Amino acid sequence: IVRPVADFSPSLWGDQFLSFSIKNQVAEKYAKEIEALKEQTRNMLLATGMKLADTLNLIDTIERLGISYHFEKEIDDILDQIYNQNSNCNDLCTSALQFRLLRQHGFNISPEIFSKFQDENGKFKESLASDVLGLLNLYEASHVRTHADDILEDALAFSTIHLESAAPHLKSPLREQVTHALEQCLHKGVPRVETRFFISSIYDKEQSKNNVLLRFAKLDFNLLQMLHKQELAQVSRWWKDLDFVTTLPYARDRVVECYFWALGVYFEPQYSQARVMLVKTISMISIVDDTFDAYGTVKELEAYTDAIQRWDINEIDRLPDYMKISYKAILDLYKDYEKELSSAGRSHIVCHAIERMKEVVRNYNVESTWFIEGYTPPVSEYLSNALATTTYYYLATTSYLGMKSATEQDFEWLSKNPKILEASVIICRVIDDTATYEVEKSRGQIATGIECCMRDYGISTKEAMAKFQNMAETAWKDINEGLLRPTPVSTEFLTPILNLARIVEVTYIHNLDGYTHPEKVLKPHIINLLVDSIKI
Numbered sequence: 326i327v328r329p330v331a332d333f334s335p336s337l338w339g340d341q342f343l344s345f346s347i348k349n350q351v352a353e354k355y356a357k358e359i360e361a362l363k364e365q366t367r368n369m370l371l372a373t374g375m376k377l378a379d380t381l382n383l384i385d386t387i388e389r390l391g392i393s394y395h396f397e398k399e400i401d402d403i404l405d406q407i408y409n410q411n412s413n414c415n416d417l418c419t420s421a422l423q424f425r426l427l428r429q430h431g432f433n434i435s436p437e438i439f440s441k442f443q444d445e446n447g448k449f450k451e452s453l454a455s456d457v458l459g460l461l462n463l464y465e466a467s468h469v470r471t472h473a474d475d476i477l478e479d480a481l482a483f484s485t486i487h488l489e490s491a492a493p494h495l496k497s498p499l500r501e502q503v504t505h506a507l508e509q510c511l512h513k514g515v516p517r518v519e520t521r522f523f524i525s526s527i528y529d530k531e532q533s534k535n536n537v538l539l540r541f542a543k544l545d546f547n548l549l550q551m552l553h554k555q556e557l558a559q560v561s562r563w564w565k566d567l568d569f570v571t572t573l574p575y576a577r578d579r580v581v582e583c584y585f586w587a588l589g590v591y592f593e594p595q596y597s598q599a600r601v602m603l604v605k606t607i608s609m610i611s612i613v614d615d616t617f618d619a620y621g622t623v624k625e626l627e628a629y630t631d632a633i634q635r636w637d638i639n640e641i642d643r644l645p646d647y648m649k650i651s652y653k654a655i656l657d658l659y660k661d662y663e664k665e666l667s668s669a670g671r672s673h674i675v676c677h678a679i680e681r682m683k684e685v686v687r688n689y690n691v692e693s694t695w696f697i698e699g700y701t702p703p704v705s706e707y708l709s710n711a712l713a714t715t716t717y718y719y720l721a722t723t724s725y726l727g728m729k730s731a732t733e734q735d736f737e738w739l740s741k742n743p744k745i746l747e748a749s750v751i752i753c754r755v756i757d758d759t760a761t762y763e764v765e766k767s768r769g770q771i772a773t774g775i776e777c778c779m780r781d782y783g784i785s786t787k788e789a790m791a792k793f794q795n796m797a798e799t800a801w802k803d804i805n806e807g808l809l810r811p812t813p814v815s816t817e818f819l820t821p822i823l824n825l826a827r828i829v830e831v832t833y834i835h836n837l838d839g840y841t842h843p844e845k846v847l848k849p850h851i852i853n854l855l856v857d858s859i860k861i
């Protein structure tokens with residue numbers, strides 16, 4: 326039986342992550358100072374008689390520095406006060422920042438705050454073109470729109486064109502901040518990634534920087550980084566002992582990239598257990614994907630799909646040897662999850678992730694049938710299958726497993742495909758389809774997203790990609806609306822879904838395709854987050 330020729334690049338990391346020995350003295354020193362710095366910072370936040378602009382800038386700085394997870398209650402109370410006092414009497418810079426921070430935190434501040442900055446036609450007053458800080462904050466704000474915010478329709482184009490015009494003559498690090506922003510907006514970036522850039526490239530170089538905050542941010546980042554490196558070591562050893570890199574040589578060797586994904590979903594220490602579970606799932610489902618995509622025959626894949634549905638070690642014998650490997654490994658991983666949640670009494674929730682995995686595999690098999698048949702479905706039918714194959718319903722569900730406060734009701738809500746989840750899935754699907762169209766088209770994938778779209782509507786490749794881009798923009802608005810209070814579950818269970826969408830934007834930036842080819846996009850991020858500490 327002829328199998329395809331292996332074509333994936335080797336892991337580019339080797340063993341450099343396999344063993345990390347934390348320096349307890351250094352760790353405890355950092356933790357001791359951070360405690361002091363944390364309290365100094367709390368008092369900055371709780372200071373009375375601050376002007377609105379000063380308060381917003383403080384909160385914004387603490388958020389960009391990556392240390393706001395220490396001050397969730399404090400920041401919430403303050404933004405809530407600002408929301409309810411409803412003061413509209415400020416300049417563009419403060420107004421746009423006020424708008425972004427409140428919306429990002431679920432406070433539905435009216436977009437009417439921007440009317441004084443527009444003419445009678447809703448277009449921004451062109452006389453604001455010389456106010457760089459206003460334009461920058463408007464630019465960042467333009468990305469948190471919902472469908473109810475069409476008044477802000479012009480904001481992105483307006484701020485973009487004038488920021489571009491001004492940038493070459495700005496002083497540093499404002500110039501670098503603007504240039505970075507135009508390439509990657511804050512709201513749609515991976516939080517650790519934006520934080521690393523902000524601390525090192527911007528705040529560290531600000532003449533006006535607060536030294537207490539800067540020191541706080543650097544220590545905290547480097548301290549959390551020690552934990553992440555410990556996690557990645559523990560995970561790298563797990564993967565090594567599985568040894569798929571030799572027994573399943575057709576499959577991608579990408580556990581580091583998978584860790585980066587999981588780190589993107591949450592970075593905080595309290596989610597350590599959750600992160601480790603999540604990265605194992607992503608690794609394992611990546612193996613299954615490649616089995617369907619680049620090795621298994623139709624008959625093999627059918628048996629594999631059936632065995633998954635039945636979910637029973639008895640079924641291994643129905644499978645070819647090489648499939649027995651991943652199949653047992655899958656069953657065992659979930660038995661590990663169950664035991665790992667036993668003492669917390671949360672073992673019962675693992676079945677939710679299993680049912681989503683079954684769904685992914687069913688749709689993988691459908692996808693294989695389509696390819697073999699040369700079937701090009703209508704867009705609606707394509708999406709009915711291809712949304713699950715992003716794995717994003719599955720990953721979002723998995724993200725909940727290690728979260729100590731995730732309840733059965735939280736899983737029940739997720740299981741109904743709520744709109745914020747569907748939007749995140751849609752974003753992953755259409756961006757991936759736009760990025761990977763050309764190569765899949767060369768591999769004879771008659772049923773790619775863009776292809777289905779072209780045939781269905783009778784439009785060009787260009788027109789199809791534009792339509793897919795609109796679907797992504799619509800979905801972001803839905804995600805943003807999905808964060809507005811009151812929320813159907815705790816915000817803590819929405820942020821993972823938002824972060825999954827950010828993962829997409831970052832991974833396929835400039836329409837590149839980055840997990841399969843981590844050299845392009847992900848390698849600098851991995852080095853910055855998991856290899857190089859921030860120099861103090």
Ligand SMILES: O=S(=O)(O)C[C@H](O)CNC1CCCCC1
Nearest residue numbers: 607608610611614714715716757
């Ligand atoms: O759905 S496809 O277009 O064929 C390719 C999807 O982007 C695959 N999503 C990844 C699967 C491997 C683990 C990380 C997620």
Ligand SMILES: [Ca+2]
Nearest residue numbers: 614615617618
């Ligand atoms: Ca695939």
Ligand SMILES: [Ca+2]
Nearest residue numbers: 757758761765
């Ligand atoms: Ca793809």
